């Protein structure tokens, strides 16, 4: 078994910026990693392609994953609307950590965030399931369009995504 690598191609108001690839820890959180992997290939008939990063706060994180309502309120898992917090073995140790956004205990859907700093206050509350493998400079470039309140000054979209390995 080798952990899956998935990629996103980011565009800023339609102009391609670059590729970010992620390693997903299916060896520690198989169910959360599988959810992100199938949503990145679109193989269940819905997924991240074409969705946006709706909330970016420089120094904190970039958040996206709402492919249903697009405004930050929706999204869903490949298991039904929401699923359980698989475990909290991994922490939010520094830039590059991939973790699930939620609305309290056991409410995981499709929304996720990429940490641009250690965010230890989220440990034990949000399930960490991946890391940026390549393209951290694209994530850094994305923060430039965010603000303290999270609204972005340009539309940041996942122009394409899929599985590499």
């Amino acid at each position: 078994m080798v952990n899956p690598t998935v990629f996103f191609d980011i565009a800023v108001d339609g102009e391609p910026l670059g590729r970010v690839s992620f390693e997903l820890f299916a060896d520690k959180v198989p169910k959360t990693a599988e959810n992100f992997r199938a949503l990145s290939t679109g193989e269940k008939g819905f997924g991240y392609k074409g969705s946006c990063f709706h909330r970016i706060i420089p120094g904190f994180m970039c958040q996206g994953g709402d492919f249903t309502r697009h405004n930050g309120t929706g999204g869903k898992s490949i298991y039904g609307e929401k699923f359980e917090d698989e475990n909290f073995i991994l922490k939010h140790t520094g830039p590059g950590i991939l973790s699930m956004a939620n609305a309290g205990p056991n409410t995981n859907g499709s929304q996720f965030f990429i940490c641009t700093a250690k965010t230890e206050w989220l440990d034990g509350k949000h399930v960490v399931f991946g890391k940026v493998k390549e393209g951290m400079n694209i994530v850094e470039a994305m923060e430039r369009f965010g603000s303290r309140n999270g609204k972005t000054s340009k539309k940041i979209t996942i122009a394409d995504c899929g599985q590499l390995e």
Binding site: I57, T73, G75, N102, A103, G104, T119, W121, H126
Partner: peptide, 11 residues
């Protein structure tokens, strides 16, 4: 504040 939630985004 600095949280990541779906539904009611808190400070």
């Amino acid at each position: 504040x600095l949280l990541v939630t779906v539904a009611l985004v808190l400070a």
